[PDB]
Design an enzyme around this catalytic site. Structure first.
Site: not given
Ligand SMILES: [Fe+3]
Ligand SMILES: [Fe+3]
Ligand SMILES: [Fe+3]
Ligand SMILES: [Fe+3]
Lengths: 510, 384, 162, 384, 511
Positions: E99, E129, E132, E194, E228, E231
């Site tokens: 992350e 990020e 995370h 990811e 997510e 992302h």
């Molecule tokens: Fe992440």
């Molecule tokens: Fe991510």
């Protein structure tokens, strides 16, 4: 172009005492025997914003806890059925207590003359709103996620069928708001909170943890975090009236009346809900009661008020003499009336009978014999055609309701206090279970006029009463209350109607 | 140590053995019997409505019988005798913002933390360097400081309402309104303390504003009106309605919005408007609840609408005269500003704005006949 | 027969619906309070229904009064035309002259029976409640536990049944 | 359904049977080897410091060896070659606000919710009735709106730093500063949209403010400075320093405090100051962070103090001229105001306030010799 | 007073975000890139800074209230299987580094994008990020504060630098995300990283953790998971924006294949090892999970959806299937052989685990179970035995190499998988490769891959000296953080490791 600066709650509270100004009609709007001093201070220096921040932190923790981990764990389902049934009554009755605490603290805030004492009372008012919503949320969560929603989801209207609700209402509804504001403070803060409500919350968390319940600890510990301020509020009330001759005249009378009022209902009901509404036992109710009343409250807390003239209640000896068997008798009576509740009650099993006998020698020959006779007659089986009230009627054991305390009692079968007093005044008969309630009524009869269930339901068939008050489940036939906690062979309204049990007023026989 | 039933293998095994296969009731909604104001029941209604154990003889109650214990002499714990307004159901009122305790404290805590950050930023930025000295020394310190006693009296007016409210929804609404009032007063004091911190020679003691409040001329009639609303009114409905729908809506609105929120910027004072913004937000939030309780529920009652409107018009007539007197006395505050700060035209326009907003929002909702020209002419008698 | 609805309530609602003048409605409300609402009530026949019927009568009387009176009268007079302030002051004076707790209780209970709203304006009635209750509590709670239960039973005039 | 180890009897029994009697280690502190800036190591320090897997050839790293995969041509993932400034430890920086992601988002969410409540109150309260139409139509729409592009460019100046910063603390601080910049730009746009909602005829389209920014005269040199600071600086330290300690501290501070925060209230505009207060709070927080990073850590570096001071003085001299030009061009906005709005004395005093604040806070911390009179006279050269 | 209450939401402000960017000559990306992200590229989620902050704050409040109140009262931090505690050390720290490097990668992508909306999506990912990173750090923080074995949880950030798995982890989630072309970095991070492993991996980790009594990890990782979708949208938008540039048809497939091989080469053995060997209760064989992840989930639905922009399945996918069956068993054999170099405690498979392995991987016994039983007879878990499995490796002539590109250790003479070794001498230095893809990567790009492996950094140093110098000891000062078992007694100390007299050698000095 300076150092970053801000003002905190203390620097604003420093000038709060000056907010109130003197004019001709700056007095309390309610009747009272005491004059609260106008220089009283408060222990906690809180403003509205700081109080909001403190409460918001706790709320975020509890609700994040309830909505993520406890829900993912099925913590609302993995609770013993008996404790799930008990939490209905416990949570709803505590909710009513907190709600009436809101009004009581509003009356106290009206009474106080110092701005700081008013600020403390207002903080407690907001706290009691928070506690009301927390208890309501306990019922909310156990309804959405519990193993049996009935009773959790409609307790606010099904509470009104059963007899225990009237006594609960008196202790945490009418005793908190009806009377002198100092007397109301003594019921709510000095006695209700210091003696029962706080140790009650802690012990409820202990018993709930013992029975797989993690929702109740999560809510009730957060509730209990607010109690230091309320205890300080009660102490401040006693301090503020301590300099008045009216205090020497009346304060001990008010304190004794408040103590007897609270104990008369919280001695049997709390012990019954603990020991009979739980599978795993934490501690005999006799020991907990002795520690709470003689140790924590009667000895230390009441001692701390000795400098202000407060004496230990004169009825404390009577309360102790009557506190040994009260909850067992109340559970006999409450199980005999299981159809009228909004919860499922269970007969003691072999392990529970052995625990009761170990902790209360002599319990068996009376209570266990009665319960085993009831079981042998089919009190749990719908086709039996038997409810224990039938046994009470057959054996000539009338069940009365105290005119003042609203607590059901059976003097001819009780092991504890077994005194009955019947009086006729102006074409009405009143029955009293002890001397203190009898004196309360004789002194002020107009305060105690509540009709009991035997008068409201006189001459009415039990099924009709249950149906009218919405005591049924969603299917429309099965009762919310049951004589057992298993998931099969539930009683329907037809099962109750087949009995043909018609309510009667026990006092008419006189 | 302590074994828990949720995690202990033996206790967990016993509990799981005792459980049923499926829930014994399919209705997993608490308060399914509460009539929803909106499409579907909310947490506000599930957690609030019917928490008060009223009997059926109090309009809307679900319980039965008398109160278990009453006052000496027989006064019920709650009763219909404590207010003039009659309704078919006291639980009908819903707060439009649908705020129970958790959202309320969440919002107030956000406001408190943002206030702290703003005060730190204001002090570090040295924006006090541009504020006019005369305005800060006289008007923020003395008169704006004196308004906190008005707000405090309006707050204290809510005590008998918080005690006597006949519904849990109404009780929660009243408590929140009063708590906002006390919060506004404490924010005025907090601004005074902040000025004391960041300005040498500034005295945060309440002695000067309190002397202005209790002994000055600008707030004499406002103080009298607050005292009457607070301690001379034993009706909780009258107290709340007259505080929020008559006195506050006119006098407090003119003072906060048309004098301080309007004239503070002309003196480089961006600090007072920051707190007046919070006060205005609180007022606009409480206004919705006030209108819902007194116009949607009681004024528009299916069986007592005409009677409730008659009573509320009576209250408006009773409490409008002292409000006009307070405004007339406060008109003398314009004689103290430096010449040229404002003219009679701006004052007249602000007065008309306040009065028109009152008539639209409150006066017309009960059929109260108010003459805007008459009211503004009466108030301006204290100006020129 | 019913906890929340029954024949008695229906009959009394029908009886209430036919009151048209404020005088008759006020007289009926006062008589109802004398007959059915206190420990000193003349009969316990309506014990299960008297509170609801009283509320219905109070609503009817309140509407009739609001219609009949003007604003000043609606603020300062009782339904029978008396000045609320004079009545309040007289009752408070009688209470202040009360010699013992029995007289004080009688005075306070009679005031509640005769002048409870909507007979009297709420402001005046609640102020009277404040003062009278203060006096009555002061008289009652003085030496609360001195009288034995036998003598207290004799004083209250109760018949001991068991 | 799933059986969990915590609650399932058999699985939990196995887990409990495998557990030891006491924790294998008595050290239960997750950053015990981090040197605490304050007395005890904080949660922010523990969760942040040393998250970047730097080797020991980057000052302060705890790893060894080269990067596993480098760029085409061989330039490292991270390296000393990406900035001029040197130091003995890149992990020495601490945000004075002790601010990791959770508290940061908490604060911004509090402000967002408070802003929504304030906007609802402002619209329901009808405070727009006092705003001057000319100020709203000509200065809120066009020039305040044109400033959102300056804030956007300053926000975009942070991408190089977000990719190239040499420590976790510096990276988090730079990211937060950039997010605050974009937030301010979006708040300007949000105010324009709100005005379009409550003022009929107001256009929220950015066409007019964007045309002013890209083709106007007052924002010309400001736009050129923003373009240079954004797309012509390849040094992340230079970008951050020149943006936050030279260009912003002077030009943005003057535009926010000394023109809009100052003149907006004079025109009955309490809306723009509401957002400029948030902008100033963000600026003061970022200033604490910037001073800690560049004056307490790099400027006071035990081994490279003098060299870092030389480099930062070079950067200040490089980017002060474009900033002075931006101010000189923006001076032309004063002739567009209504006659009598402000005079030369007030403008000069405000310029001196901004310049003296900059000299105290930034210029004097690196021993940069700045003439306040020369800078102020240069900025006033374009007053007409 | 006089108006209706009104406000402005995130959508009404985002409606004009596309015009924020203006045109000037130097408005171009600062990083080398073959592609051109087209302007006028829109983003799926209409967010502004404050709305994003509010929605992240809700999740943060919920998660931290759960951790601080009910899970601490339940003692959930202690009632976790020791094996899963050790596994969570590695899992949390390595995801945290992933992350953290994703922060910088997304910052580079934000620099690369030209549309204000694509920039906004990348900026929201940058903040995510950071979130995370702090969340994984908090998992380690909580387990150190409240767990049964703080060591390794409390200093993973400096004790990870001893062992060889950390080098490969750095290459996948540190250098792969930020070193190279911005589109290539996105393919490693979003399109493959990811979408292929990290996304499903988080949920798989929550499953395996719940099975092992761990409630902290589900609480944090499900909240991490809630982010997510944005992302994945960012990766999709990257591929869409570069789709119309002619450079895509030339380079996108090569970059995608290289990214896929980079990610799979490390995550096929490591994730299987951590799942199957680092847990007591097994949720699913790793072969089935991998097979579902790569061909049914990612190489199917995902790449199938993306194919309309010229994206096609990687050409090394068949080789990944071929090598993925036994990868994690070989990796665990090697990792256990080098247990002194870790920051976590390892255990040998027990009887039930051995039977589970032989049931799900037929033939697993005769190789891996027999080797483990040989080691257990040699006393590999007894500090007084004086045996570490590396000694057995050296005795039987099974040298361990480190891939020059991926950094994954491998033993060709013993592996059931690849078993192919390449040794080249270029300009005085020897490089060892385990596959054709890494060999081609190095031959084409020699200056990108220069990392020194543990056998070169540690060449000639006694093991105890390396462990002590890098702080691989517990708060006692003599007991090691790494152990060959998960029991509470008979722990190894630095004195035992010193008595072994194990001196690292360079395996490539034999040529
Ligand atoms: Fe992440
Ligand atoms: Fe991510
Ligand atoms: Fe409470
Ligand atoms: Fe309390």
């Amino acid at each position: 172009n300076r150092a970053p600066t801000s003002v905190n709650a203390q620097e604003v509270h420093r000038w709060l005492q000056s907010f109130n100004w003197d004019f001709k009609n700056n007095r309390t709007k309610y009747a009272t025997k005491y004059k609260m001093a106008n220089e009283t201070k408060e222990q906690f220096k809180l403003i509205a914003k700081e109080y909001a921040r403190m409460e918001a932190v706790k709320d975020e923790r509890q609700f994040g806890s309830l909505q993520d981990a406890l829900t993912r764990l099925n913590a609302g389902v993995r609770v013993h059925p008996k404790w799930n049934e008990t939490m209905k009554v416990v949570s709803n009755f505590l909710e009513v207590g907190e709600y009436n605490a809101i009004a009581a603290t509003g009356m106290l805030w009206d009474s106080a003359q110092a701005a700081e004492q008013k600020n403390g009372y207002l903080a407690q008012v907001l706290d009691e709103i928070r506690h009301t919503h927390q208890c309501a949320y306990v019922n909310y969560y156990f309804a959405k996620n519990g193993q049996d929603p009935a009773g959790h989801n409609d307790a606010r209207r099904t509470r009104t069928i059963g007899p225990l609700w009237k006594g609960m209402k008196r202790v945490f509804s009418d005793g908190f708001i009806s009377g002198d504001a100092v007397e109301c403070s003594l019921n709510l803060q000095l006695v209700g909170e210091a003696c029962f409500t706080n140790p009650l919350i802690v012990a409820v968390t202990e018993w709930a943890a013992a029975n797989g319940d993690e929702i109740t600890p999560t809510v009730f510990l957060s509730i209990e975090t607010d109690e230091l301020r309320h205890m300080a509020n009660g102490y401040q009330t006693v301090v503020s009236i301590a300099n008045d001759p009216a205090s020497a005249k009346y304060l001990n009378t008010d304190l004794n009346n408040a103590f007897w009022t609270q104990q008369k209902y919280f001695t049997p009901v709390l012990g019954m809900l603990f020991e009979y509404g739980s599978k795993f036992k934490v501690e005999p109710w006799v020991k907990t009661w002795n520690r709470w009343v003689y140790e924590d409250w009667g000895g230390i807390w009441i001692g701390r008020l000795g400098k202000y003239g407060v004496e230990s209640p004169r009825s404390l000896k009577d309360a102790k003499q009557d506190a040994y068997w009260a909850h067992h008798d109340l559970y006999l009576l409450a199980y005999a009336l299981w159809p009228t509740g909004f919860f499922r009650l269970a007969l003691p099993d072999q392990e529970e009978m052995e625990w009761f006998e170990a902790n209360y020698p002599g319990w068996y020959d009376h209570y266990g014999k009665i319960y085993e006779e009831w079981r042998a007659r089919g009190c749990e089986d719908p086709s039996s055609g038997f409810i224990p009230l039938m046994w009470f009627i057959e054996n000539n054991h009338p069940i009365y309701i105290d005119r003042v305390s609203q607590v059901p009692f059976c003097p001819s079968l009780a092991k504890g206090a077994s005194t009955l007093r019947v009086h006729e005044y102006n074409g009405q008969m009143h029955t009293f279970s002890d001397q203190w309630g009898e004196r309360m009524w004789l002194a002020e009869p107009e305060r105690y006029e509540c009709q009991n269930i035997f008068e409201q339901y006189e001459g009415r068939e039990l099924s009709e009463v249950i149906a009218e008050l919405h005591g049924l489940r969603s299917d429309g036939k099965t009762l919310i209350a049951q004589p057992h906690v298993r998931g099969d062979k539930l009683w329907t309204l037809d099962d109750i109607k087949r009995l043909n049990c018609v309510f009667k007023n026990p006092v008419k026989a006189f | 140590e302590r074994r828990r039933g949720l995690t202990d293998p033996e206790m967990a095994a016993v509990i799981l053995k005792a459980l049923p296969e499926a829930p014994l009731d399919g209705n997993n909604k608490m308060g399914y019997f509460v009539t929803p104001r909106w499409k579907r029941l909310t947490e506000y209604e599930a957690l609030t409505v019917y928490a008060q154990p009223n009997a059926d003889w109090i309009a809307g109650g679900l319980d039965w019988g008398d109160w278990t214990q009453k006052f000496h002499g027989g006064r019920p714990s709650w009763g219909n005798e404590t207010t003039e307004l009659r309704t078919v159901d006291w639980f009908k009122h819903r707060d439009p913002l649908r705020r129970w305790h958790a959202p309320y404290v969440k919002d107030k805590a956000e406001e408190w933390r943002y206030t702290d950050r703003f005060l730190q930023g204001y002090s570090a930025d040295g924006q006090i360097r541009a504020m006019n000295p005369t305005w800060r020394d006289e008007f923020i310190n003395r008169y704006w400081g004196a308004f906190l006693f008005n707000e405090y009296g309006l707050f204290n007016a809510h005590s008998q309402g918080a005690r006597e409210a006949l519904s849990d929804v109404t009780r929660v609404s009243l408590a929140f309104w009063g708590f906002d009032k006390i919060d506004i007063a404490q924010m005025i004091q907090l601004e005074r303390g902040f000025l004391a911190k960041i300005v040498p020679g500034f005295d945060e003691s309440t002695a000067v504003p309190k002397a202005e409040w209790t002994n000055g001329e600008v707030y004499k009639s406002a103080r009298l009106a607050v005292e009457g609303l607070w301690q001379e009114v034993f009706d909780w409905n009258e107290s709340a309605f007259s505080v929020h729908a008559v006195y506050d809506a006119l006098f407090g609105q003119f003072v906060r919005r048309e004098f301080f929120q309007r004239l503070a910027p002309r003196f480089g004072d961006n600090l007072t408007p920051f707190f007046i913004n919070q006060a205005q937000t609180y007022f606009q939030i409480a206004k919705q609840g006030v209108q819902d309780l007194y116009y949607n529920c009681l004024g528009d009652d299916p069986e007592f609408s005409d009677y409730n409107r008659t009573v509320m018009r009576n209250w408006t007539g009773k409490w409008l005269e002292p409000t006009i007197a307070a405004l007339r006395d406060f008109m003398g505050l314009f004689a103290k500003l430096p010449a040229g700060t404002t003219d009679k035209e701006e004052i007249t326009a602000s007065l008309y704005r306040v009065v028109d907003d009152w008539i639209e929002d409150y006066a017309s909702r009960i059929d109260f006949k108010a003459d805007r020209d008459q009211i503004v002419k009466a108030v301006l008698a204290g100006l020129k | 027969l019913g906890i929340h609805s029954n024949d008695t309530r229906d009959a009394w609602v029908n009886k209430i619906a036919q009151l048209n003048t404020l005088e008759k409605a006020a007289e009926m409300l006062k008589q109802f309070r004398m007959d059915h609402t206190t420990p000193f009530r003349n009969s316990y026949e309506l014990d299960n229904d008297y509170l609801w019927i009283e509320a219905k009568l109070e609503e009817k009387v309140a509407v009739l009064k609001a219609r009949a009176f003007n604003e000043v009268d609606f603020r300062h007079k009782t339904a029978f035309g008396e000045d609320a302030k004079s009545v309040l002051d007289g009752t408070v004076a009688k209470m202040n002259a009360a010699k013992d707790k029995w007289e004080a209780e009688k005075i306070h209970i009679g005031f509640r029976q005769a002048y409870k709203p909507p007979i009297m304006p709420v402001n005046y009635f609640l102020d009277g409640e404040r003062q009278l209750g203060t006096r009555l509590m002061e008289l009652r709670n003085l030496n609360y536990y001195d009288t034995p239960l036998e003598e207290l039973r004799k004083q209250r005039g109760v018949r001991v049944v068991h």
